[PDB]
Amino acid sequence: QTYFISGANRGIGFSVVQRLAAKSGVKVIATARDPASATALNELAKENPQVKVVQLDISDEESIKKIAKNVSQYTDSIDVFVSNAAIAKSFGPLLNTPREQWIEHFFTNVLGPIRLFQELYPLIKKGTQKKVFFISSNAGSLNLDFGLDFSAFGQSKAALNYSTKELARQLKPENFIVAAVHPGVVETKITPEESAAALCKLFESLNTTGKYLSYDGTELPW
Amino acid sequence: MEQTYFISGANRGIGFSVVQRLAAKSGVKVIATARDPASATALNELAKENPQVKVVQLDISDEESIKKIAKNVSQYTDSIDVFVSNAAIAKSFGPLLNTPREQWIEHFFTNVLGPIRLFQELYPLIKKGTQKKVFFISSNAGSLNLDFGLDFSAFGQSKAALNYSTKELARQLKPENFIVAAVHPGVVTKITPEESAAALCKLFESLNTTGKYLSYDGTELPW
Numbered sequence: 001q002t003y004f005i006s007g008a009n010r011g012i013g014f015s016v017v018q019r020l021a022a023k024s025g026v027k028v029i030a031t032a033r034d035p036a037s038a039t040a041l042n043e044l045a046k047e048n049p050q051v052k053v054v055q056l057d058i059s060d061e062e063s064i065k066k067i068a069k070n071v072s073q074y075t076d077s078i079d080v081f082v083s084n085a086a087i088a089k090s091f092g093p094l095l096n097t098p099r100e101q102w103i104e105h106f107f108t109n110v111l112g113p114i115r116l117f118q119e120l121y122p123l124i125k126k127g128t129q130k131k132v133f134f135i136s137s138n139a140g141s142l143n144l145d146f147g148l149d150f151s152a153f154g155q156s157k158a159a160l161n162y163s164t165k166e167l168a169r170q171l172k173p174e175n176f177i178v179a180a181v182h183p184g185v186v187e188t189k190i191t192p193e194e195s196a197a198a199l200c201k202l203f204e205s206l207n208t209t210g211k212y213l214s215y216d217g218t219e220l221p222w
Numbered sequence: 223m224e225q226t227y228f229i230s231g232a233n234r235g236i237g238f239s240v241v242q243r244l245a246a247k248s249g250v251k252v253i254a255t256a257r258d259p260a261s262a263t264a265l266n267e268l269a270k271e272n273p274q275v276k277v278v279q280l281d282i283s284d285e286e287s288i289k290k291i292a293k294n295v296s297q298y299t300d301s302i303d304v305f306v307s308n309a310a311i312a313k314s315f316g317p318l319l320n321t322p323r324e325q326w327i328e329h330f331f332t333n334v335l336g337p338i339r340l341f342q343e344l345y346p347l348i349k350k351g352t353q354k355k356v357f358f359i360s361s362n363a364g365s366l367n368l369d370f371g372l373d374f375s376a377f378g379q380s381k382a383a384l385n386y387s388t389k390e391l392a393r394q395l396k397p398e399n400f401i402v403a404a405v406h407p408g409v410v411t412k413i414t415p416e417e418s419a420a421a422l423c424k425l426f427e428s429l430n431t432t433g434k435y436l437s438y439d440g441t442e443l444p445w
């Protein structure tokens with residue numbers, strides 16, 4: 001079973017790859033913007049050569065244009081796709097959010113994942129599990145009130161949520177399992193190791209498409 | 223008792239019908255925008271007959287046009303009572319795998335960033351007015367909780383993103399007594415733009431509560 005994970009160099013992404021590298025019969029395509037600086041992940045891949053380290057910047061269309069061939073070097077298929085790489089840089093009031101923050105969150109957090117999926121769709125189509133996870137945020141819900149504003153961050157997660165919902169409908173006949181997942185705050189904060197563990201078991205047990213899920217397996221409103 | 227309205231995309235469609243409807247009311251000044259005012263025949267004709275209609279250039283896809291809207295509107299008015307972000311595009315429908323990069327980008331810049339930047343530039347003028355009413359012309363296709371059995375692709379995504387930011391804005395400007403709404407103007411099941419405009423103008427007049435997602439008939443939609 002081939003897993004693909006964007007942003008595997010640090011955070012939850014690293015913790016998810018750490019966990020898969022201990023699981024027998026798991027090939028892992030792990031991405032980093034800058035693999036030669038990805039010390040922890042390059043070490044992970046040397047001690048566990050089933051872990052393949054590939055370049056991806058999801059903000060960079062030229063990098064996304066290369067991801068299908070970069071993945072194609074190591075596998076004929078993807079079972080479980082995880083769009084994890086993302087940014088969270090702008091919060092607070094709309095009047096105080098400049099153009100560049102709106103633009104950056106759209107390109108990195110919405111366009112990136114849509115283009116990434118478009119490029120890797122043929123490889124996912126040939127796999128067995130056809131499981132597709134976009135790492136989202138509960139802040140992206142149009143129906144939760146945290147007593148906070150999330151500015152471009154929140155808008156970006158809501159935009160990708162909208163398209164994830166549509167993708168779930170569109171791919172249901174091809175028996176794809178498409179989910180948006182809040183990995184927790186790494187609300188009580190959790191360790192990347194804890195988010196990873198919960199995410200892993202969610203990834204294995206999820207059998208229906210079109211869900212918006214917290215890491216604990218409970219549903220969120222869109 | 224004189225009210226100023228700002229309507230973007232006033233050269234045709236709902237915007238034109240809204241400006242046409244406001245032009246008939248006494249004591250209402252209208253700042254009406256067009257991408258290309260020289261070719262805005264019907265709107266220019268309306269402005270010739272009714273001097274309370276001022277026509278100004280605005281391209282909401284264009285940061286350079288948006289950077290000028292505040293100073294240009296200020297030649298015609300010291301305040302805006304009712305702001306209506308109507309100018310937008312609807313060019314991208316159907317499945318995610320068939321929607322190329324440029325359609326996602328165009329709907330982001332035109333339908334999300336444009337309205338947000340336009341509001342930022344015009345806020346001071348709206349702050350200075352009495353009604354403090356802020357309308358974003360959205361779509362029921364932007365809802366995260368409606369199913370129409372249609373794919374809305376970059377159009378729907380853009381309406382959901384603008385919806386997300388509208389709801390936040392309503393929270394931020396509640397202590398300044400702003401009324402902020404996202405409004406579905408109808409499908410122009412279909413109605414005419416003059417029917418939409420009649421319903422929309424009644425809605426803009428009566429709404430006295432912020433943070434609503436409404437249809438033209440004044441019923442609420444789920445976000």
Ligand SMILES: NC(=O)C1=CN([C@@H]2O[C@H](COP(=O)(O)OP(=O)(O)OC[C@H]3O[C@@H](n4cnc5c(N)ncnc54)[C@H](OP(=O)(O)O)[C@@H]3O)[C@@H](O)[C@H]2O)C=CC1
Pocket residue numbers: 006007008009010011012013032033034056057058059060084085086087088108135136137138182183184185186
């Ligand atoms: N943490 C939380 O509480 C919650 C967060 N989330 C999501 O969880 C995700 C997990 O991120 P996490 O690693 O834990 O935290 P960080 O944001 O600290 O790290 C983000 C990851 O994304 C990568 N990344 C950033 N920009 C790009 C880019 N342009 N191209 C490619 N990769 C990029 C980073 O690489 P690099 O090291 O080079 O910067 C890194 O792997 C978040 O990215 C977010 O969308 C959602 C809800 C809850």
Ligand SMILES: NC(=O)C1=CN([C@@H]2O[C@H](COP(=O)(O)OP(=O)(O)OC[C@H]3O[C@@H](n4cnc5c(N)ncnc54)[C@H](OP(=O)(O)O)[C@@H]3O)[C@@H](O)[C@H]2O)C=CC1
Pocket residue numbers: 230231232233234235236237256257258280281282283284307308309310311312332359360361362406407408409410415
């Ligand atoms: N009517 C419906 O059934 C539905 C429509 N809506 C909303 O309805 C509103 C009005 O629709 P309708 O009256 O039929 O519009 P039309 O389709 O007839 O025209 C759209 C308007 O937007 C203007 N516009 C487009 N791009 C720009 C730009 N870059 N800068 C400035 N103005 C621009 C147009 O100008 P130009 O002539 O130069 O193109 C025109 O005034 C829109 O906000 C739309 O999102 C929402 C969903 C459902």
